[PDB]
Design a protein around this ligand. Sequence first.
Ligand SMILES: *[C@@H]1O[C@H](CO)[C@@H](O[C@@H]2O[C@H](CO)[C@@H](O[C@@H]3O[C@H](CO[C@H]4O[C@H](CO)[C@@H](O)[C@H](O[C@H]5O[C@H](CO)[C@@H](O)[C@H](O)[C@@H]5O)[C@@H]4O)[C@@H](O)[C@H](O[C@H]4O[C@H](CO)[C@@H](O)[C@H](O)[C@@H]4O[C@H]4O[C@H](CO)[C@@H](O)[C@H](O)[C@@H]4O[C@H]4O[C@H](CO)[C@@H](O)[C@H](O)[C@@H]4O)[C@@H]3O)[C@H](O)[C@H]2NC(C)=O)[C@H](O)[C@H]1NC(C)=O
Ligand SMILES: *[C@@H]1O[C@H](CO)[C@@H](O[C@@H]2O[C@H](CO)[C@@H](O[C@@H]3O[C@H](CO[C@H]4O[C@H](CO)[C@@H](O)[C@H](O[C@H]5O[C@H](CO)[C@@H](O)[C@H](O)[C@@H]5O)[C@@H]4O)[C@@H](O)[C@H](O[C@H]4O[C@H](CO)[C@@H](O)[C@H](O)[C@@H]4O[C@H]4O[C@H](CO)[C@@H](O)[C@H](O)[C@@H]4O[C@H]4O[C@H](CO)[C@@H](O)[C@H](O)[C@@H]4O)[C@@H]3O)[C@H](O)[C@H]2NC(C)=O)[C@H](O)[C@H]1NC(C)=O
Ligand SMILES: *[C@@H]1O[C@H](CO)[C@@H](O[C@@H]2O[C@H](CO)[C@@H](O[C@@H]3O[C@H](CO)[C@@H](O)[C@H](O[C@H]4O[C@H](CO)[C@@H](O)[C@H](O)[C@@H]4O[C@H]4O[C@H](CO)[C@@H](O)[C@H](O)[C@@H]4O[C@H]4O[C@H](CO)[C@@H](O)[C@H](O)[C@@H]4O)[C@@H]3O)[C@H](O)[C@H]2NC(C)=O)[C@H](O)[C@H]1NC(C)=O
Ligand SMILES: OC[C@H]1O[C@@H](OC[C@H]2O[C@H](O)[C@H](O)[C@@H](O)[C@@H]2O)[C@H](O)[C@@H](O)[C@H]1O
Ligand SMILES: *[C@@H]1O[C@H](CO)[C@@H](O)[C@H](O)[C@H]1NC(C)=O
Ligand SMILES: *[C@@H]1O[C@H](CO)[C@@H](O)[C@H](O)[C@H]1NC(C)=O
Ligand SMILES: *[C@@H]1O[C@H](CO)[C@@H](O)[C@H](O)[C@H]1NC(C)=O
Ligand SMILES: *[C@@H]1O[C@H](CO)[C@@H](O)[C@H](O)[C@H]1NC(C)=O
Ligand SMILES: *[C@@H]1O[C@H](CO)[C@@H](O)[C@H](O)[C@H]1NC(C)=O
Ligand SMILES: *[C@@H]1O[C@H](CO)[C@@H](O)[C@H](O)[C@H]1NC(C)=O
Ligand SMILES: [Cl-]
Length: 968
Amino acid sequence: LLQKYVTWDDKSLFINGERIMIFSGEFHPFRLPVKELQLDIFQKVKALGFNCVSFYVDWALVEGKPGEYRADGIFDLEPFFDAASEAGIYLLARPGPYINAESSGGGFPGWLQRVNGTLRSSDKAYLDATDNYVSHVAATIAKYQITNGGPIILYQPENEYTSGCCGVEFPDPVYMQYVEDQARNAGVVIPLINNDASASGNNAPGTGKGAVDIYGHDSYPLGFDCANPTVWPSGDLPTNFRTLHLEQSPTTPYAIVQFQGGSYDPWGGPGFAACSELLNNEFERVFYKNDFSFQIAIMNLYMIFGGTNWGNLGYPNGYTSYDYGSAVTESRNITREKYSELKLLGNFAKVSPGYLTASPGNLTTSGYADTTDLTVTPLLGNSTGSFFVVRHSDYSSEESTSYKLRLPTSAGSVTIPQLGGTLTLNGRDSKIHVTDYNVSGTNIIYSTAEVFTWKKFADGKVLVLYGGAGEHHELAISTKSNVTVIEGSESGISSKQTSSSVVVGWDVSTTRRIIQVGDLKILLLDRNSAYNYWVPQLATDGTSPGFSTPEKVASSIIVKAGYLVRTAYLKGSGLYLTADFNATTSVEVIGVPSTAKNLFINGDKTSHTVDKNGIWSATVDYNAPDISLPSLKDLDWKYVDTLPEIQSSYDDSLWPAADLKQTKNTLRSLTTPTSLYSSDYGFHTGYLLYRGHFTATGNESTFAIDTQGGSAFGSSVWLNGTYLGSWTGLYANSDYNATYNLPQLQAGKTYVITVVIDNMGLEENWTVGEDLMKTPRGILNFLLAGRPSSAISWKLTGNLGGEDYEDKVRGPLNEGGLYAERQGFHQPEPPSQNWKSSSPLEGLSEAGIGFYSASFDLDLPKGWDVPLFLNIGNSTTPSPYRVQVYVNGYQYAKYISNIGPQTSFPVPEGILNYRGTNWLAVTLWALDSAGGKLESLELSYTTPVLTALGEVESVDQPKYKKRKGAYH
Ligand SMILES: *[C@@H]1O[C@H](CO)[C@@H](O[C@@H]2O[C@H](CO)[C@@H](O[C@@H]3O[C@H](CO[C@H]4O[C@H](CO)[C@@H](O)[C@H](O[C@H]5O[C@H](CO)[C@@H](O)[C@H](O)[C@@H]5O)[C@@H]4O)[C@@H](O)[C@H](O[C@H]4O[C@H](CO)[C@@H](O)[C@H](O)[C@@H]4O[C@H]4O[C@H](CO)[C@@H](O)[C@H](O)[C@@H]4O[C@H]4O[C@H](CO)[C@@H](O)[C@H](O)[C@@H]4O)[C@@H]3O)[C@H](O)[C@H]2NC(C)=O)[C@H](O)[C@H]1NC(C)=O
Ligand SMILES: *[C@@H]1O[C@H](CO)[C@@H](O[C@@H]2O[C@H](CO)[C@@H](O[C@@H]3O[C@H](CO[C@H]4O[C@H](CO)[C@@H](O)[C@H](O[C@H]5O[C@H](CO)[C@@H](O)[C@H](O)[C@@H]5O)[C@@H]4O)[C@@H](O)[C@H](O[C@H]4O[C@H](CO)[C@@H](O)[C@H](O)[C@@H]4O[C@H]4O[C@H](CO)[C@@H](O)[C@H](O)[C@@H]4O[C@H]4O[C@H](CO)[C@@H](O)[C@H](O)[C@@H]4O)[C@@H]3O)[C@H](O)[C@H]2NC(C)=O)[C@H](O)[C@H]1NC(C)=O
Ligand SMILES: *[C@@H]1O[C@H](CO)[C@@H](O[C@@H]2O[C@H](CO)[C@@H](O[C@@H]3O[C@H](CO)[C@@H](O)[C@H](O[C@H]4O[C@H](CO)[C@@H](O)[C@H](O)[C@@H]4O[C@H]4O[C@H](CO)[C@@H](O)[C@H](O)[C@@H]4O[C@H]4O[C@H](CO)[C@@H](O)[C@H](O)[C@@H]4O)[C@@H]3O)[C@H](O)[C@H]2NC(C)=O)[C@H](O)[C@H]1NC(C)=O
Ligand SMILES: OC[C@H]1O[C@@H](OC[C@H]2O[C@H](O)[C@H](O)[C@@H](O)[C@@H]2O)[C@H](O)[C@@H](O)[C@H]1O
Ligand SMILES: *[C@@H]1O[C@H](CO)[C@@H](O)[C@H](O)[C@H]1NC(C)=O
Ligand SMILES: *[C@@H]1O[C@H](CO)[C@@H](O)[C@H](O)[C@H]1NC(C)=O
Ligand SMILES: *[C@@H]1O[C@H](CO)[C@@H](O)[C@H](O)[C@H]1NC(C)=O
Ligand SMILES: *[C@@H]1O[C@H](CO)[C@@H](O)[C@H](O)[C@H]1NC(C)=O
Ligand SMILES: *[C@@H]1O[C@H](CO)[C@@H](O)[C@H](O)[C@H]1NC(C)=O
Ligand SMILES: *[C@@H]1O[C@H](CO)[C@@H](O)[C@H](O)[C@H]1NC(C)=O
Ligand SMILES: [Cl-]
């Protein structure tokens, strides 16, 4: 329409006139705010065979103050976009404004609680509120469109605009048209794609006003019950997706914009380890190949890398980790078997253009395989080849099943295996069998083993096939050449020539076999060997792989290695690889260019041998360095009381008065004389403090209070210095009604109720019209027994300045309203010389909140990617306490002793300084009259990785400075 770089037909996207299968992973830059590690992730994605990444922008982080857009420093999108270009990864941009994403407010800044209009609607007050954000973020996206030589190819307006309620006329076409025009007006010309939460046809082409260019939808078919990771409920595998697609948007390529790549996990949940078992390699091979059965052309996995909900950016139901059980873990490692499995499928799609031109058929329980226990969905092509996705009919089945295939080919139909034996599908597995598969002019008539990759080189073609252990396979090639075994044993390999073909049968073995037929060499692998193969693009005009264009895809090499192969480039007589290693690794390169005489690995010349088949071999030794981590308990811990409010000399005269008689919140009208909704006064994040002044009659007995901080929140109440009690919190409670007994008060004297409330983050806004993001935080109701409500005059604070937030570098959400946070003591080099020496492991002997500070040096070796973790002990049932940990001023742990489950908190390099000084600031809130302490506090590490990554630059870490706007 508006440009010619990205077009489409009913089958696929075209980029620069060439078909491409978009295989994408979701990655949120705001959850990993270190630019060098962003490149790390992009390179890990590219090594999967993927060509795309989808990303959200979190409005709440970049317009914390209305009218001040700040997407600078750690929030700058431009380095993120340049990292993608550098890695050769296209981008799908999803700036919202509404993103959901398990983020606070679902992306909405807390000041939307004051907007007089329905959120995600055509009400002018909402639309007006979005204009400044979108005109900024969309302009930045516009600058980096592929039309300008950038990486961005698709744009998503809104997010899951799918369900409405409560008076809204859903779907409102005026609303979506407006959101679409905002993007266009900012210079976005690439196609717009939506992500319907279910296949409901919302905003599909042909729906008139508000229609997007390409209809997309989402799917999380395995659900989120991470507690039972082996349970695959009956009927949960989608079977009707192509049918739905042909009804809802037949003129556009089939797109799933969010397909399950993991799961969220709430406070009190089973943990992301369990989620990684549910969405493991078996889920991938069955469910992802099932999406290929619908001829999916655009496929984005949510998430490919989850990262961390640092600095309170997450929604109330989730905790600090957003590991998500995804293929790349929170600490950026790719050890999970699901990464390697995903790599196999991703690399298959990258080299199989006939997949996109084929005609998909209906699934069948007969006619292709000889048992109804199997289901086969065919994708038929004449000249361009066919594809057959095989799985168990009951998809949850762990049975081993013998079968034979009857498949059509250009050479006529054939019953396979022709030479004897049977095929096997073992349990939770799925296969894509191929017929008439083009290996650069050589026709593979059929193969039962799955294709990993193939390449054409100067001295021949190479094809890499794999099967699971215990499987027999067969292939046939259009050729009059015989077959020769050129590596490995000839036993298990059977063969026969016909007049225009050669047929070869084999059993999967842990030992590789290589066979030769004419100029085609075929590697026959087991799945676990195939896991160690890589297909980097080979650059000949620089060091960067470039995007996955057909010419650069064709010019790739095949590398057997270990943990990771990032890049490859040819320079003079040198073949350069960049790779990471977590063990001693034999490296083999297949398809070494004719001109290459030396091998370099990460810039170092590396001895190699050449075997009789022309394969380069080398060894890279892994010798982990001494990692010296300080013992956090032995540091010089400095303590200050960060609840001075409960001492009798505290002066709150500078605090904002909670004196608004009308709320600006449209969702919930006041049930108190003045608003005690935190967001009415610009406080949207972290711990909140309320102070209630009154004069006693002498006859007060109880104080009742309804506090609300979101799921798993807690609160604590004092009358002057006297602790009244706490709500220690439950995931099930987002608010709590408590009645506290008061001590004997003296008639005529003034007293102050101090209330501390944990704001877990603002609610999402999933249903349009419900306005749940407006759910307030703070105090909803109170009753001082025998006194009118107006007897208490309230003051409150959250983060200092509220929306005029102090820390422009670390963002609007990082710090809450504790005295120590207000003063900025959580930053590097606080004024702690005169403070008391006391450790969080000694802790508090009564209810309250302590603030602890210590520095420590690190001196970790260059060239090693070492994941570090903060650990808080929980070996036995603890008393109730809450902890926040700030690392160089950045909050990277929120901990609830009685709820969990997180005890291990990763902190990335860049936030931590691996060769320099670091600062820990710990808040410890005891919700128990007997106080509380940390059982243990430890730094740890996991497998050091010898890495190709460059120096990781430390992000800006502003040191402590006296804040003139503080209340002292
Ligand atoms: C890739 O990235 C991943 C995500 O970033 C990363 O996974 C994370 O790794 C960290 C660090 O290992 C994990 O934290 C640890 O979790 C341990 C508990 O889980 C283990 O045990 C379970 C029960 O059997 C298993 O279910 C579980 O397996 C599952 O999860 C695995 C991933 O971890 C996965 O591979 C499997 O497939 C499976 O799904 C798992 O094996 C926990 O024990 C551990 O705490 C100890 O270690 C800390 C030091 O590092 C201490 O600070 C802490 O106090 C604990 O140490 C104490 O306990 C041990 C005894 O059991 C002793 O060995 C210690 O010396 C110490 O003992 C003292 O204290 C004891 C009291 O507890 C006492 O008994 C002793 O006398 C003594 O006083 C830590 O929390 C985190 O959970 C993982 N996160 C996720 C999302 O998975 C992965 O590591 C990365 N991989 C690589 C290679 O980089
Ligand atoms: C350096 O980097 C390397 C990557 O480049 C990295 O290597 C990778 O390391 C991970 C582990 O961190 C490997 O994944 C594990 O592999 C385990 C071994 O099995 C694999 O290899 C075998 C051959 O050697 C294969 O036969 C095997 O295939 C079989 O099993 C598959 C998976 O179950 C199945 O799909 C196949 O069809 C086939 O049947 C497999 O390929 C593997 O056992 C382990 O699986 C468990 O953990 C996963 C989560 O991490 C789960 O998703 C999975 O379901 C398994 O869970 C079981 O074990 C857990 C304990 O960890 C429990 O929590 C679960 O409840 C469950 O336990 C039940 O069953 C157990 C088995 O009987 C039993 O013990 C329990 O009692 C209970 O009944 C996981 O997939 C990965 O393969 C490696 N990748 C490569 C390329 O090599 C290396 O580790 C890094 N090194 C360092 C030092 O950091
Ligand atoms: C340190 O160690 C200590 C000691 O071991 C750890 O303490 C343990 O922590 C556990 C996890 O927090 C805790 O278990 C929980 O107990 C409560 C009941 O008091 C229960 O609600 C929890 O189970 C639900 O919630 C979790 C998520 O928090 C879900 O994963 C789980 O599936 C359950 O979900 C249900 O309730 C939710 C809230 O209502 C719903 O959203 C959800 O849909 C589901 O609701 C259905 O079922 C409900 C009934 O279960 C029903 O009401 C509703 O109508 C729906 O049908 C979980 O059992 C242990 O009690 C606690 N143990 C001890 C001895 O104290 C501590 O966590 C550790 N700390 C760290 C940092 O690791
Ligand atoms: O990590 C969850 C992820 O969910 C996306 O929607 C979740 C929502 O959508 C499904 O299709 C289905 O309707 C529901 O079961 C499910 O809750 C969301 O778009 C994304 O931002 C994130 O929240
Ligand atoms: C197979 O690939 C070769 C070389 O790329 C090409 O010339 C030919 O058109 C392809 N054949 C088919 C049937 O697609
Ligand atoms: C093809 O090779 C096989 C053994 O690999 C052999 O049995 C057969 O005779 C060969 N065919 C011809 C025509 O040489
Ligand atoms: C919003 O606007 C209407 C019309 O001006 C007004 O009557 C109402 O009081 C407002 N509501 C809130 C919560 O500000
Ligand atoms: C004080 O309170 C008690 C119980 O609330 C009540 O019975 C009594 O009337 C009150 N005394 C005065 C002087 O108001
Ligand atoms: C607390 O009381 C209020 C007002 O009576 C009620 O609306 C709210 O639902 C109650 N909260 C809980 C957690 O029961
Ligand atoms: C209670 O605290 C306030 C200040 O927080 C103080 O001014 C007042 O005198 C205290 N009351 C008593 C009875 O000590
Ligand atoms: Cl202050």
